[PDB]
């Protein structure tokens, strides 16, 4: 039960990756993939708590 | 994994699987290694799946 909205790149090496990524540091956000041509187990559901 | 860092930045560190940053205490049972030299136009074509 906490919120986190961060666009800063999370480093995964030794050099400080404040704004440079591509060699050894990864972006912490990735996109979803929802195609109708996918399987039944790869379909998006609109879930509410 | 100290040999991974002091051998210059790598062009293509992109990979699918467990991140190497959390392999400090994750002891395994069996592991093998092998190397080869291939054209860089298909270095992105070496990936699982």
């Amino acid at each position, epitope marked *: 039960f906490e919120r986190d909205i961060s*666009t800063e*790149i999370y480093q995964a090496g030794n050099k400080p990756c404040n*704004g*440079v*990524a*591509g*060699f050894n540091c990864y*972006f912490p956000l990735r*996109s979803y993939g929802f195609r109708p041509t996918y399987g039944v187990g790869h379909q998006p559901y609109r879930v509410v708590v | 994994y100290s040999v991974l860092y002091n051998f210059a*930045p790598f*062009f293509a560190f*992109k990979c699918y699987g467990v991140s190497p940053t959390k392999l400090n205490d994750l002891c395994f049972t069996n592991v093998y290694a092998d190397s080869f030299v291939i054209r*860089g*136009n298909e270095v*992105s074509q070496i990936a699982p799946g």
Partner: antibody
Amino acid sequence: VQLVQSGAEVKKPGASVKVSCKASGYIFSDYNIHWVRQAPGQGLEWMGWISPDSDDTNYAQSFQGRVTMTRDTSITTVYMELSSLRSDDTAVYFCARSVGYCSLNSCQRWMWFDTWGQGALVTVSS
Amino acid sequence: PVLTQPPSASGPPGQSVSISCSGSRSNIGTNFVYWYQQLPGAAPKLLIYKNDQRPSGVPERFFGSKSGTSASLAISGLRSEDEVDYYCAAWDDSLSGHVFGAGTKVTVL
């Protein structure tokens, strides 16, 4: 696919252009359309993107009051309205089909333009 | 701001010519760069996306690369179609809009 649009002739400054990029070869509910201009010599300039299903238009930080958007569904076109033009950006306008649907500004990370509309020579002169 | 590009990195045909696309800290280095192919006096089109894969119909001879803050595209040999301009572009969080290149022209010798 086809991204055909009409060609507006020379118009005096202080009016609004009228060009419609007709959508064909796909469904008009999932593909974001983008509008750019290309002055000779220099590169390209980005204006904005239009949601095909709803009126959710986000504009750039270059032009805000000059450019105003509206959309339609039954005709399956797009309306251009550039009020108070100035004779300093005589450029050809292109409509570029981009794969993927997104509504927020953070979506522009895995976005590219696959096909672009053909040339429509549009300028302003007296 | 705008991406800095060389004016004309031309090269003779028969050997590879390297082109560079240097940006800023926020313009590139956190997002993915794209390279756009345009015929002279015609509409542009995309050449490569996400520095890893190419669209269908795009020849394998082409290749794209990045250096953390500068993007590089590799072409080996020039032909009757390789006398065209190369554009480099990406997206940035500083301006919350598209950032496009300046312009580069390559010609045979």
